[PDB]
Design a protein around this nucleic acid. Structure first.
Ligand SMILES: Nc1ncnc2c1ncn2[C@H]1C[C@H](O)[C@@H](COP(=O)(O)OP(=O)(O)OP(=O)(O)O)O1
Ligand SMILES: [Mg+2]
Length: 417
DNA sequence: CTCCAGGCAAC
RNA sequence: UUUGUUGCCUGGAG
């Protein structure tokens, strides 16, 4: 049956190679992915037997506080490499049981689906005429998952008692706080490979309810939003759907994040929309802000890196960044921040030549005319002031940065379309 | 298409 | 320090 199919050699090797590919930091017992094979070779006889019997209670997860993009802190729960290995093996077999029967409009944590699919569908509704969003998000979503309501929804498709106990064991598994196991009454650990699937299994009913009501929506994990014809209809469905998941499913809603605003006045998966009669996809203000922040630190202040290395490091971020944000239909802002990147990249180039003699040497070598060299080389104007002067645009223009290895943001934006 | 390494995004 | 799912981007071996 199922737990036999989970523990098949072929399934465990694919689960092994995943854990090893991730190179995650060790769980509570300090064994890294680098010695996962040698661990299982030594202890599989004990592990294999113990878990199929129903007795195996897994190792408690490790608590790690990390920052979230919103502002606050996220409590991680890192299982042991073997518990990551086992959870992966469960996930690999449970996926084809549940995933085909998940909603058409569910895009989070699923294979062959991404954030772009969720945004394009969301755009489709506002483009047709449903020009008001019912934005929503849940408070501490993974932490506030009730074990009984989860396992009930798991029990619908998987009838095997051995795996239901195994999944519950991982839910039950505690946290090790300075050498004591603290029991977990509610919540799946953020860090267990099986946790995202379990999250979708619970919210599967939310999709079916919204599908039953005949509502247009796009879900990506807890970030769910429903699109409507007017604000009255949007306000109506907001508190109605709020009470559904709060009583039937028992999950709290984040009222700070949840709102019934216009779609172009809110952010959905790092994107927003435009006021236009056909609503174009644009960058969210935070998406621009985070790019700026990352470019500001990559360009060297008290940091100290080689110049061509920084061009490679900026390329490596920006080319990766535009890989995701290519979905936007506004090259104007992309042209602006590309120019801004160059102005930031001139700040380092300018500060590299501190003395005027080196400035005169480098500008003359670059091909700038002798009148322009002397006019700017010995200026009282600040570094950020001199970066936007006619002289430094000429000497260190887009032509220079392209010829010295810098990848054009807007070029690759077009080349990815 | 599967596999390897480096990265970027969403949650 | 930093786990996880999922998707893509760049290079390499089949
Ligand atoms: N880096 C991550 N590692 C592991 N799980 C994550 C990570 N980021 C997000 N998740 C998971 C766990 C979260 O409960 C779930 C929904 O994300 P998110 O809404 O950002 O956090 P949250 O729902 O726990 O808190 P919040 O109250 O701030 O919305 O996605
Ligand atoms: Mg949330």
């Amino acid at each position: 049956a199922l737990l036999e199919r989970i523990l098949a050699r072929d399934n465990l090797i694919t689960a092994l190679k995943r854990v090893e590919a991730n190179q995650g930091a060790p769980g509570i017992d300090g064994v890294s992915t680098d010695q996962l094979r040698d661990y299982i070779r030594a202890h599989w006889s004990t592990i294999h037997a113990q878990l199929l019997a129903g007795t195996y209670r897994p190792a408690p997860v490790r608590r790690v506080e990390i920052p979230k993009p919103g502002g606050g802190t996220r409590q991680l729960g890192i299982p042991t490499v073997v518990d990551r290995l086992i959870q992966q093996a469960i996930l690999q077999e449970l996926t084809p049981i549940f995933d085909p029967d998940f909603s058409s409009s569910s895009f989070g944590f699923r294979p062959g689906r991404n954030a772009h699919d969720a945004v394009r569908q969301a755009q489709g509704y506002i483009q047709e005429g449903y020009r008001y969003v019912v934005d929503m998000d849940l408070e501490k979503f993974f932490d506030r998952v009730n074990h009984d309501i989860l396992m009930s929804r798991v029990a619908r498709k998987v009838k095997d008692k051995r795996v239901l106990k195994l999944i519950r064991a991982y839910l039950q598994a505690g946290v090790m706080i300075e050498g004591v196991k603290v029991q977990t009454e509610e919540g799946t650990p953020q860090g267990g490979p099986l946790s995202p699937l379990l999250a979708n299994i619970l919210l599967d009913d939310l999709d079916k309810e919204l599908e039953k009501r005949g509502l247009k929506f796009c879900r990506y994990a807890d970030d769910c939003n429903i699109y409507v014809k007017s604000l009255r209809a949007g306000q109506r469905v907001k508190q109605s759907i709020q009470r559904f998941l709060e009583k039937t499913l028992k999950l709290k809603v984040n009222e700070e994040k949840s709102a019934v605003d216009r779609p172009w006045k809110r952010a959905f998966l790092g994107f927003s929309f435009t006021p236009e009669r056909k609503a174009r996809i644009r960058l969210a203000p935070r998406s621009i802000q985070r790019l700026k922040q990352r470019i500001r630190q990559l360009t060297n202040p008290n940091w100290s890196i080689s110049m061509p290395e920084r061009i490679h490091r900026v390329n490596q971020y920006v080319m990766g960044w535009i890989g995701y944000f290519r979905l936007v239909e506004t090259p104007s802002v992309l042209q602006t921040i590309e120019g801004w990147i160059r102005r930031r990249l001139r700040l380092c180039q300018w500060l590299q030549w501190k003395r005027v003699r080196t400035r005169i040497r480098e500008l003359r070598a670059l091909g700038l005319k002798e009148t322009a060299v002397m006019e700017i080389a010995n200026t009282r104007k600040g570094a950020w002031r001199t970066t936007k002067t006619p002289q430094l645009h000429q000497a260190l223009g887009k032509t220079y940065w392209t010829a010295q290895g810098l990848k054009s943001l807007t070029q690759r934006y077009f080349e990815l379309r």
